[PDB]
Design a protein around this ligand. Structure first.
Ligand code: RBF
Length: 170
């Protein structure tokens, strides 16, 4: 039944939006970087149903969060762009031969791409957002690499240990 999958997707974008209110800065200096575990639900959906569906969960969840927090379109756009890359790369790698090996490799390749991708965009957004010299991005660089690494690392480890316990329940 597709309605069982629509239910699953609709449920998991609702939890992805709720859990986002738990955001907090891991680094008090780079306080604009806030961690939230909202992509663990999307990565589960990506793994159990397809990369495109998991990315769709990230977009629905961030749209809903922006309407409730309209004060930050820049900081939600970057979360949306990175979350869909991370959960997209991981699911595409993994679905070519569903196993833990390509689940593990899917999340590592996705984590390192999203982090480099973050560094490239965080290189272009930080000076504009703070109306500051490129100096400041280089000052933020060690926090940016460390943060998007811990964020998508913990999201990978958590997802890895939970998402087949989720396939059993279905
Ligand atoms: C300037 C700016 C840069 C951000 N950079 C990253 C990033 O590089 N990697 C990431 O995972 N999240 C990043 N975020 C995600 C951030 O936690 C999210 O957008 C929050 O809603 C910002 O308050 C960034 C946010 C902002 C505002």
């Amino acid at each position: 039944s597709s309605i069982k999958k629509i239910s699953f997707v609709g449920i998991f974008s609702a939890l992805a939006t709720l859990v986002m209110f738990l955001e907090f800065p891991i680094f008090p200096q780079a306080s604009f970087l806030k961690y939230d575990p909202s992509e663990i639900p999307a990565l589960i959906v990506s793994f159990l149903l397809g990369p495109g569906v998991g990315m769709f969960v990230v977009l629905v969840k961030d749209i809903l969060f922006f309407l409730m927090k309209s004060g930050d379109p820049v900081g939600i756009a970057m979360n949306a762009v990175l979350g869909m890359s991370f959960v997209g790369i991981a699911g595409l790698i993994y679905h070519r031969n569903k196993s833990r090996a390509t689940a593990i490799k899917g999340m590592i390749v996705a984590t390192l791409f999203a982090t480099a991708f973050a560094l490239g965009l965080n290189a272009l957004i930080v000076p504009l957002y703070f109306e500051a010299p490129f100096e400041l991005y280089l000052k933020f660089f060690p926090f940016i690499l460390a943060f998007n690494l811990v964020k998508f690392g913990i999201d990978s480890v958590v997802t890895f240990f939970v998402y087949k316990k989720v396939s059993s329940i279905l």
